[PDB]
Design a protein around this ligand. Structure first.
Ligand code: 7ZE
Ligand code: NI
Ligand code: NI
Length: 332
């Protein structure tokens, strides 16, 4: 209720943070897992912004206040949380570094920010749930319900005193960047991914894809956002498997609320149907993740390691289905 604001101690701490030298090299790689470095996550974001956009892209104070306030407006939910925000932002960084000059300075700063912000104030409930039970948000936002709220939260944080990192842009560039962020955030609505990917595959296979065409650029950026949102499936298996535990914790919690409202949940959301999880993963990788990274690699060749990793993880789920799993550790 209201927008939360970081403490002076919080942003000043981030300002003096220094990244360990050994991680510099690691942060460049797609498969990098932020997991073991929690105290460093905000500093990792500063580092990526500085490397991609320059140490003078944003005023350091406004940037540190922005980052720490963004953190404070992620809720303590199992998956759609601050950890996921930084993971998605790190994926975008790796994509941008590998494709740097395809994107404008305005796009890079807008996308890194869009990724950090893209699940702001997530409550651990899906668009399906909010619309089924007519939460106030579904009244306000008829489609892409959570995504429109995440954008609105982004704008609220920028509006906090001393938090507007984009103020020094020309009025034209300011409006362009807010549009980059809005489109990028909305694009993380998976309902829109299916159409976008089919369109892109079509433009690619016929050779009409043209990055000089703004509607094409917007669509390629949308698929980048999907790729980054889903990137837990491109990590090393143990990391992917552990993250799946977190995702399913939210799903099962939503399913439990549905049962209280007299409605049996979809199996994916049913904690009494865990046997169906490996097949559900197969379905998800075949329907969403594999096609995503497949098309993204056609359009941006350097992103090929995301697709190779996603394929390796599909193989691991297939192993699970056939009863070939080995010992597994969980944090419960
Ligand atoms: O939507 N996801 O982020 C996601 C990630 C990994 C596995 C999933 N399985 C089913 C639905 C969504 C999934
Ligand atoms: Ni989301
Ligand atoms: Ni997300």
């Amino acid at each position: 209720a209201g927008t939360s604001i970081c403490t002076s101690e919080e942003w000043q701490g981030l300002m003096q943070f220094t990244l360990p030298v050994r991680l510099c090299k690691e942060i460049e790689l797609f498969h990098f897992d932020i997991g073991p470095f929690e105290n460093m996550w905000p500093g990792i974001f500063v580092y990526m912004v500085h490397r991609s956009c320059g140490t003078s892209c944003f005023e350091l104070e406004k940037l540190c206040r922005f980052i720490m306030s963004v953190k404070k407006n992620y809720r303590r939910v199992p998956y759609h949380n601050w950890k996921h925000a930084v993971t998605v932002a790190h994926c975008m960084y790796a994509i941008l570094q590998n494709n740097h000059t395809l994107f404008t300075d305005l796009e890079r700063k807008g996308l890194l920010i869009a990724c950090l912000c893209h699940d702001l104030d997530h409550r651990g409930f899906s668009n399906s749930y909010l619309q089924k039970f007519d939460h106030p948000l579904a009244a306000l936002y008829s489609t892409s319900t959570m995504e429109q709220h995440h954008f609105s939260q982004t704008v609220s944080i920028l509006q906090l005193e001393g938090h507007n990192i984009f103020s020094t842009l020309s009025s034209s560039e300011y409006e362009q960047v807010l549009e980059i962020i809005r489109k990028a955030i909305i694009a993380t609505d998976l309902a829109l991914y299916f159409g976008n990917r089919k369109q892109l595959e079509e433009m690619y296979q016929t050779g009409s894809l043209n990055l000089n065409n703004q509607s094409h650029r917007d669509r390629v950026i949308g698929l980048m956002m999907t790729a980054c949102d889903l990137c837990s499936v491109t990590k090393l298996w143990p990391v992917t498997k552990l993250t799946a535990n977190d995702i399913y914790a939210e799903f099962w919690a939503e399913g439990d609320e549905m049962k209280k409202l007299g409605i049996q949940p979809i199996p994916m959301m049913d904690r009494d149907k865990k046997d169906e999880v490996p097949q559900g993963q197969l379905g998800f990788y075949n329907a969403v993740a594999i096609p995503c990274y497949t098309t993204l690699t056609q359009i941006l060749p350097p992103t090929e390691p995301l697709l190779k990793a996603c394929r390796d993880n599909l193989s691991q789920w297939e192993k699970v289905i056939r009863g070939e799993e080995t010992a597994t550790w969980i944090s419960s």
